[PDB]
Amino acid sequence: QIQFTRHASDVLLNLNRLRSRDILTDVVIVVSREQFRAHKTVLMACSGLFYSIFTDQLKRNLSVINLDPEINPEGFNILLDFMYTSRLNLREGNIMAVMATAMYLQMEHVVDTCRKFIKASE
Amino acid sequence: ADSQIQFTRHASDVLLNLNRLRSRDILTDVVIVVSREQFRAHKTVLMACSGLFYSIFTDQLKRNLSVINLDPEINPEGFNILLDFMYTSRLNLREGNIMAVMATAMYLQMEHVVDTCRKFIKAS
Ligand SMILES: C[C@H]1CN(C2COC2)CCN1c1cc(NC(=O)Cn2cc(-c3cc(Cl)c(O)c(C(N)=O)c3)c3c(=O)n(C)c(C(F)(F)F)nc32)c(Cl)cn1
Numbered sequence A: 001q002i003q004f005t006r007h008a009s010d011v012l013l014n015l016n017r018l019r020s021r022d023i024l025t026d027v028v029i030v031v032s033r034e035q036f037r038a039h040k041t042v043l044m045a046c047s048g049l050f051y052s053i054f055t056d057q058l059k060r061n062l063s064v065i066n067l068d069p070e071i072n073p074e075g076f077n078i079l080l081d082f083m084y085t086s087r088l089n090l091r092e093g094n095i096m097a098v099m100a101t102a103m104y105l106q107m108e109h110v111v112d113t114c115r116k117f118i119k120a121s122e
Numbered sequence B: 001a002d003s004q005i006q007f008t009r010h011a012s013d014v015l016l017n018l019n020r021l022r023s024r025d026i027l028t029d030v031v032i033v034v035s036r037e038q039f040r041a042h043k044t045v046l047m048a049c050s051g052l053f054y055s056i057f058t059d060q061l062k063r064n065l066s067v068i069n070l071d072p073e074i075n076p077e078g079f080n081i082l083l084d085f086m087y088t089s090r091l092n093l094r095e096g097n098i099m100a101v102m103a104t105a106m107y108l109q110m111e112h113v114v115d116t117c118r119k120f121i122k123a124s
């Protein structure tokens, strides 16, 4: 069929615009003292943890999810921006936190990219 | 010591997973009614892909509606082609459907689809 090569990226951009305007967000993720509003569909599409949560009968209808308090909010922020943008901002000062947060969120390609960053920088 | 990494497959992988959720009726939040067919979807995806749906659901008086009735003169098969396009990036244009898809894309305010329809006509 006719393939629109920019369509998926344009969809994601528009989803990120909805998130910035707080339109149809349906969950708050709490990470220590920081709160992040998001769309469950995007979280589920991007994360094994969120897919498991929002397919679990006991948890799927929650509108507030408290993540492990040991997770670094900056690590989560970097990963949530990645979910909505395809762009992953890695630095020596954040790599360990992003990698551990990606393991927790079950984002395997992000973890592999973090390993590649360690290989390139250690 | 620093790197800004673009994941070139990420957006298409997100969209595939959204289509998987729709196919299982997970987190769908609206039924679009088009003449003799009902279609379930995610409002966020509809808004992301169509000027009409963007305008409808940005309106706070319509944002939380669970059923939207479209103009009854819209061809439901044209709509289904466009809904599948929204969730897949693939558009099935054929001589037997081009006029219906084009007219539906005008109504949904999907300009790059409309333009692709015009290119199809030009090449027919
Ligand atoms: C279950 C699956 C297959 N099933 C088939 C098999 O028989 C039928 C059809 C239904 N499918 C399905 C899956 C959905 N969501 C997920 O898969 C959640 N998800 C997302 C990712 C993910 C996505 C993108 Cl886009 C990325 O860029 C990256 C990255 N850069 O790291 C990571 C991911 C992951 O890395 N991992 C290990 C995992 C983990 F679970 F393995 F841990 N889960 C991840 C959604 Cl929403 C809807 N349907």
Ligand SMILES: C[C@H]1CN(C2COC2)CCN1c1cc(NC(=O)Cn2cc(-c3cc(Cl)c(O)c(C(N)=O)c3)c3c(=O)n(C)c(C(F)(F)F)nc32)c(Cl)cn1
Residues within 6 Å of the ligand: A004, A006, A007, A008, A010, A011, A014, A015, A017, A018, B047, B048, B049, B050, B051, B052, B054, B109, B110, B111, B112, B113, B114
């Ligand atoms: C308004 C915009 C920019 N604004 C910036 C500018 O300063 C601040 C920020 C907020 N923004 C925003 C917009 C959102 N949604 C839409 O734009 C709706 N949408 C989507 C499309 C569209 C999208 C994809 Cl992916 C396609 O593949 C195709 C296609 N192949 O045809 C068509 C589309 C369109 O073609 N047309 C004419 C129109 C129309 F309205 F013009 F008619 N609307 C379309 C969403 Cl959800 C969230 N935020």
Ligand SMILES: [Cl-]
Residues within 6 Å of the ligand: A017, A020
């Ligand atoms: Cl914006």
Ligand SMILES: [Cl-]
Residues within 6 Å of the ligand: B020
């Ligand atoms: Cl599948």
